[PDB]
Design a protein around this nucleic acid. Sequence first.
DNA 1: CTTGTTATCCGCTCACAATTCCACACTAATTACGAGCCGGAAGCATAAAGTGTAAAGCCTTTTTTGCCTAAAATGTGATCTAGATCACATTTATTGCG
Length: 201
Amino acid sequence: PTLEWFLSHCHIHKYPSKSTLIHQGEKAETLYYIVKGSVAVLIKDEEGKEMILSYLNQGDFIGELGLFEEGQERSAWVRAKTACEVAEISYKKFRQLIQVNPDILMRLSAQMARRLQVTSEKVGNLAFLDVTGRIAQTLLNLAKQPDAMTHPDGMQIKITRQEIGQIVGCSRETVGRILKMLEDQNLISAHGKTIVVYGTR
DNA sequence: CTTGTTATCCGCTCACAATTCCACACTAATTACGAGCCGGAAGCATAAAGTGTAAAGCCTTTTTTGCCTAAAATGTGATCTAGATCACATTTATTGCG
Ligand SMILES: Nc1ncnc2c1ncn2[C@@H]1O[C@@H]2COP(=O)(O)O[C@H]2[C@H]1O
């Protein structure tokens, strides 16, 4: 449909792992779209602690905020998590496609609504719910993600002990303590990054 | 031889000054006077209907002030679990290469 009409003017260019698709400081002159794989977006402070806002899997767009208002810069950093195939379309030639077919814009701004609902309703849980409650909800949220692999016992995901604290809002030390505590009670499992939870499904 | 028109000459009335900015300093003479006349206005107070101004005399509406106190917001500090904090040491999992 409209999606196929979008790939007719794209520029196929594969990006290796640990690459740089979006550099905070450069000029936004290329729209990116995810075909296969996944990518992560995060920011940094003055020390070195990271902070992931939201994850973007396949079928999502990369850097679309610098399209509505011409003359902007890259907000956050976008590092390629895994081998992903991303297209390339200049914003200049994109604006001409909207004036002749606004329907194409109805697709991009359609995914910008869900990314706001999962963030606004998350703040409330990061002010009342304790560590046990915040992490508990996170386990189910990551299980609903398409990048999650089906497990005979439950769900198998791969996330570090830092990214967890960046979602529930806490220190990295606290995460490791509770994580190992649930292991003794036979509730979940962890072997570095891969965390297999139980009770799901 | 005398006459005409024509050409040359003169004095005359006639038409006719064009390289381009600024500064400093300086400058005007003369018709006889006196007495009598009517003129405008000096601005005087007057006075009136008409007009537009300038006191402040109680009403009504707004706006700051001081008021009361019923109901909601606010420290007391010593103990106690769930939270946070640094640096930069060492250990860990990411996508490939060969
Ligand atoms: N919380 C978020 N949810 C979804 N996308 C994001 C989020 N934060 C940053 N991004 C994307 O990261 C991109 C960084 O570059 P852009 O400003 O071009 O566009 C930004 C967004 O598209």
